[PDB]
């Protein structure tokens, strides 16, 4: 099935003697070198899409001071999150995938895995927080609220709290950062066992706290928001903008949900089927399927929630 | 709290709405407190207050349906508020009051007196609709929202109309703030 290592796991049998370290040999026996050529080029593509959108969001807020409102902070956060994925992830991956094997050593492996994962988690919980904010604002559940800058700060801070609750444990001994898939990119070890780092407890913790809870919250919040807008539209049959808002909001909520399922249900399904189907074995081609869907969110969560968001189309 | 400007005419009926307890009334409903400001809006009485109202939720504009003399006064006062640089996006709640006095007025006084171009038969359902159309004709603001209601002189209970309209205004604005619609 695979070559077990301390800092690594290469999905390829050593009974032949061919396998080498992912910190060592160009992994052209996992896949022909054309595949790693494309790999490095693809990281540069997403650098040249992600940093444009995500930096420009920050820049625009500076330029136009009309946008500096509490509700937009978590989208600024989202932009920030994806820039970790550009530099911690894509740039340092660029300098390794160009070779075929991970260049900056296992300490660079922890740095890459950490900052990439930190950005991905900040984005995840930014979207959870965004749904929560819109729920409270529109549905008015508490009904004795104002929502000021203090609440926006708590919302942003909470995403960093949760992101660290995921990205930092592999730095102290709860799971490990290792090269996954084609072994040029380091991430969480959700796919092997390791009793020294307690991978099983980490993976279960991940699946529930960092998937099921975010998904439940996002479905619930946007569900209540759509119900509220539908209900308002029902009562004001002759109010054109509410009928418009009903249709537009529902279009966007469906987009939001599908974006989040595309982004995370790959890792969720892969890790869960690794967990319950122990009699299995996957190689780099399929171990990078979930990495694919998650990494590209650095582009199209900024598109879906910032570009399409009606307070930034007017700067365009 | 909600800021509601209350405009119209001296004999339009807002004098009765304001009493449901710059002249400020503090009526309330559904854990939501309203600040209702009875002000003038003529021209000469409009620079006295327009510069110190900001964050006005809605403008309640009243019209005496039976009063043809003040009709064009109200049409132009309306136009000059609805299209006013401070209230170009502040949604309007339009009461056409004295519905029944108009229902009897129109029987003995054709609508053509103040709209000569009117070609319809002088029946309540058509003349009142024509008046409503004339006020909304002046909107000239894409997504303004004008919430209309025709009030049975004093014989009705039209505070609910105000609050449904205000909630609709509020949810539209909160969506706007979130970046949705
Ligand atoms: C380029 C790669 C990055 C930023 C990879 C990030 C990966 C994660 C944040 C993965 C998280 C999860 C698990 C490890 C298991 C359960 C599902 C997730 C998404 C919560
Ligand atoms: C597997 O065998 C290759 C053949 O030399 C060797 O280079 C590598 O270190 C071995 N790794 C493990 C984990 O046995």
Numbering used by the authors:
A (entry chain A): 2 to 317
B (entry chain B): 33 to 53, 185 to 231, 242 to 354
Give the authors' words:
The light-sensitive visual receptor rhodopsin is the prototypical class A (rhodopsin-like) GPCR. It is activated by light-induced isomerization of the covalently bound ligand retinal. Mini-G proteins comprise the guanosine triphosphatase (GTPase) domain of the α subunit of heterotrimeric G proteins and are fully capable of stabilizing GPCRs in their active state, generating characteristic changes in agonist affinity and recapitulating G protein specificity in vivo.
These three mutations do not affect negatively the structure or functional properties of active rhodopsin. Attempts at creating a mini-G protein from Gt were unsuccessful, and therefore, we used the related Go (62% sequence identity). Crystals grew with p61 symmetry, in which the crystal packing is mainly mediated by hydrophilic contacts between mini-Go molecules. In the receptor, the major contact regions to mini-Go are located across the cytoplasmic ends of transmembrane helices TM2, TM3, TM5, TM6, and the TM7/H8 joint, with additional contacts mediated by the ICL3. The C-terminal portion of the α5 helix in mini-Go contributes most of the interactions to the receptor, as previously observed in Gs coupled to other GPCRs. We observed that the conserved Gly352H5.24 of mini-Go forms a backbone–side chain interaction with Asn3108.47 in the receptor, placing it very close to the TM7/H8 joint.
